[PDB]
């Protein structure tokens, strides 16, 4: 009808959502978790120093077995190695050397990779030929791939440079579901434990929750000030942390539809490249652009620990499913394990 | 204590490490050149002329003087996540020299030369590009020479204090503008070259500029400058 009328209606709906969030905010997470005893200073040492990459490590992912770790390098290599004995199980070269994201299937049979090339490459680790071949080269995006996650052996969610997310199947091989609600460059994806919802951040301050079955963004959160680069779902599945180019890591809750806390410190001024939660959800690990990583208290919002074992910018950070170890990969081609 | 399967897995990991170390030599000897344009700057013609020596991301890998060169083209840096080119050796920037009177196709009262300078400024000001060198290729040199005599550049740019209707003066003015628009003029050298799609010695200039860049960083590593 009228553009001005539509803009006025959008502003009114935004004000209504803001008023509802303010009314539902009778307290704060810090005011409630103030009575909780602090975790205290934690000490995580480099148990394993996985080396061998020829360039900077960009992504990582853990399997269900909590033993095999996949890592992508700018030299066009996916290295899947055992964490207990630092032995490289597989080392597969990539057609496109520019890789930015890698995902390990929960069943352990498949792996996925993507990056500056708009082609998401899925390889089958378990094959009779022995060599891990290229099972699929699925490509229907208009921008560079940024994140990949495996829902199952058939469904896979990916995000590209454009403001779209894509759910693909392996049986048909095409883009089954499309999400076109964002406005910026989508960066990271995190699947909920129930494999039905996933939050995604873009170049703007908006982090949107998308449903796998419905296909529409149920909730959005606009509380940051720069581009959200990292994402991680809470172990329970109703919360998620977002890290941006500023030192602030903000925790949002799906049920409350509002931010809970903002883990940040005046000393830290760099950005965020990777955010991961522990199995209990009490400790929130975040990789910063500086030569170290931090571990905050997810409830009390305090810097519990600092891991300064990496010499270059920490790029990828992951926590095992059982919570035994934490893998950290920086641009110095060195993957480290912390316990 | 390692069992038979454990020792065999260790041996397989050692073979993988040996292959990776063998490829590490080629990785270190590799010279990465990020190719970027500015719109109607002879991109397709330049790629066609380069494929002779060679024979959205496009990779052209070749070997010159027993050293490998890999040219990566984006295909047409506004996402803040393109820091993947922080380790490239150099960046080629192609600009059309006939953009004085060539208004942008959008016709929003702006010359293509201003847009090219703005793109160059936004690219060189990136922090990840502080350690990389820049090689500026101003294409359409013959078209520039044929156009500067028809229309003077002083009418559209009120900062050319030199003598109009010439060729060397306009080239010097363009080089000076591209160099002053960059804000470091030190960390890494800037190289300017004027050529068209006729000659095939364009790769020799790129090789010479890459050699000069490697010499410049070896001088810093050697504590000579």
């Amino acid at each position: 009808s009228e553009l001005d009328q539509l803009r006025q209606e959008a502003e009114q709906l935004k004000n209504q959502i803001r008023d509802a969030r303010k009314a539902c905010a009778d307290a704060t997470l810090s005011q409630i978790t103030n009575n909780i005893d602090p975790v205290g200073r934690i000490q995580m040492r480099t148990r394993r120093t996985l080396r061998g990459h020829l360039a900077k490590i960009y992504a990582m992912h853990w399997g269900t077995d909590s033993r095999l770790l996949v890592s992508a390098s700018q030299d066009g290599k996916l290295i899947i190695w055992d964490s207990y004995t630092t032995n490289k199980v597989h080392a597969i070269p990539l057609r496109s050397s520019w890789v930015m994201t890698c995902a390990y299937a929960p069943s352990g049979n498949y792996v996925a990779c993507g990056g500056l090339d708009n082609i998401c490459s899925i390889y089958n680790l378990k094959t009779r030929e022995g060599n891990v071949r290229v099972s699929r080269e699925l490509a229907g995006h208009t921008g560079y791939l940024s994140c990949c996650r495996f829902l199952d052996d058939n469904q896979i969610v990916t995000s590209s440079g454009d403001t779209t997310c894509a759910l693909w199947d392996i049986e048909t091989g095409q883009q089954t579901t499309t999400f076109t609600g964002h406005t910026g460059d989508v960066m990271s994806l995190s699947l909920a434990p129930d494999t039905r919802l996933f939050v995604s951040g873009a170049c703007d301050a908006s982090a949107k929750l998308w449903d796998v079955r419905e296909g529409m963004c149920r909730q959005t959160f606009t509380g940051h000030e720069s581009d959200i680069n990292a994402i991680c779902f809470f172990p329970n599945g109703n919360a998620f942390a977002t890290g941006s180019d500023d030192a602030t890591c903000r925790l949002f809750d799906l049920r409350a539809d509002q931010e809970l806390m903002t883990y940040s410190h005046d000393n830290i001024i760099c950005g965020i490249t990777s955010v991961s939660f522990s199995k209990s959800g009490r400790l929130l690990l975040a990789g910063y652009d500086d030569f170290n990583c931090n571990v905050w208290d997810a409830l009390k919002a305090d810097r519990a620990g600092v891991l300064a074992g990496h010499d270059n910018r920490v790029s990828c950070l992951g926590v095992t499913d059982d919570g035994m170890a934490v893998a950290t990969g920086s641009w110095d081609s060195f993957l480290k394990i912390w316990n | 204590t390692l069992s038979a399967e454990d020792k065999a897995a260790v041996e397989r990991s050692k073979m993988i490490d040996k292959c990776l170390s063998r490829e590490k030599t080629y990785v270190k000897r590799l010279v990465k050149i990020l190719l970027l344009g500015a719109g109607e700057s002879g991109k397709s013609t330049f790629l066609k002329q380069m494929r002779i020596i060679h024979g959205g991301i496009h990779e052209y890998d070749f070997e010159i003087k027993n050293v490998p060169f890999k040219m990566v083209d984006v295909g047409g840096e506004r996402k803040r996540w393109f820091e993947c080119f922080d380790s490239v050796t150099s960046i080629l920037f192609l600009v059309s020299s006939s953009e004085f009177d060539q208004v942008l196709m959008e016709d929003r009262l702006t010359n293509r030369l201003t847009e090219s300078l703005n793109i160059f400024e936004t690219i060189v000001n990136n922090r990840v590009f502080s350690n990389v060198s820049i090689i500026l290729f101003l294409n359409k040199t013959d078209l520039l020479e044929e156009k500067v005599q028809i229309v003077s550049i002083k009418d559209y740019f009120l900062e050319f204090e030199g003598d109009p209707h010439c060729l060397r003066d306009v080239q010097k003015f363009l080089v000076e503008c591209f160099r002053n628009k960059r804000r470091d003029q030190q960390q890494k050298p800037l190289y300017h070259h004027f050529t068209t799609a006729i000659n095939t010695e364009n790769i020799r200039l790129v090789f010479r500029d890459v050699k000069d860049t490697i010499l410049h960083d070896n001088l810093k590593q050697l504590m000579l400058q």
Partner: single-chain antibody, 233 residues
Framework: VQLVESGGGLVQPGGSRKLSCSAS????????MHWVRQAPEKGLEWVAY????????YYADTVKGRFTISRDDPKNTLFLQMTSLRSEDTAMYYC??????????????WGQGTTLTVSASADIVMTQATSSVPVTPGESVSISCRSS???????????LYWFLQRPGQSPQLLIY???NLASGVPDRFSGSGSGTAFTLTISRLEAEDVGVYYC?????????FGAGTKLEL
């Protein structure tokens, strides 16, 4: 995935020969190889093993130094050069591929092998409970095995392989590491054990389930098989 073995025939005692195995359908350079033997009146016996990168080469105590094994990766071929053959070498030789990593299935594919006839200890001993047990279709059969020493290792996973050999066919991986089923086998097979005594349970038997079941350990390089339990219709 195919292994074709050739170079078999009647050889006078004290002679020499060269068995050649051609591999296809898989990366030969990424798989370690094992030459095993089976006597017409006995069970399987391990002979030699070569690594994927030709770095780890081992032989059985009975053929230590007497035989040699090599591989050509550009040609995808495996050569077994044997010299001074005796009556103990008159058997059918099989070539087996095995890749070693976390979650791998070593001894997955067995070649057809080739026969060889002649005119003429600190090792783990695997003992089968019964040489042959009568079975019926649709029933449950439990094959028991005993080892000289515990096969449990400090790494946490046992190393026990149950294999099936049908009459007139090459052996096939049935269960590896006592817990994981091989690729392309029915889920009716199950394996259990505390480290010394091992059990293989088969429910809802079929026509192809009959044959000789063998047990193998993988803790030391001198791999030893078992007597083999014969399940007949």
């Amino acid at each position: 995935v195919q292994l074709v073995e050739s170079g078999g025939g009647l050889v006078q005692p004290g002679g020499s020969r060269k068995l050649s195995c051609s591999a296809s359908g898989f990366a030969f350079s990424s798989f370690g190889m094992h030459w095993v033997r089976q006597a017409p009146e006995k069970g399987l016996e391990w002979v030699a093993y070569i690594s994927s990168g030709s770095g780890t080469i081992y032989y059985a105590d009975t053929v230590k130094g007497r035989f040699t094994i090599s591989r050509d990766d550009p040609k995808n071929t495996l050569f077994l050069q044997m010299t001074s053959l005796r009556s103990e070498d008159t058997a059918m030789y099989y070539c087996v591929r095995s890749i070693y990593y976390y979650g791998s299935s070593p001894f997955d594919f067995w070649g057809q092998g080739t026969t060889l006839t002649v005119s003429a200890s600190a090792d783990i001993v695997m003992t089968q409970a019964t040489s042959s047990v009568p079975v019926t279709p649709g029933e449950s059969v439990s094959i028991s095995c005993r080892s000289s020493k515990s096969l449990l290792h400090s790494n946490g996973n046992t190393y026990l392989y149950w294999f099936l050999q049908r009459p007139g066919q090459s052996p096939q991986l049935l269960i590896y590491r006592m817990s994981n089923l091989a690729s392309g086998v029915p889920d009716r097979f199950s394996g259990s054990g505390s480290g010394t005594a091992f059990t293989l349970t088969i429910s809802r038997l079929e026509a192809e389930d009959v044959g000789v079941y063998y047990c193998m350990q993988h803790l030391e390089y001198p791999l030893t098989f078992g007597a083999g339990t014969k399940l007949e219709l």
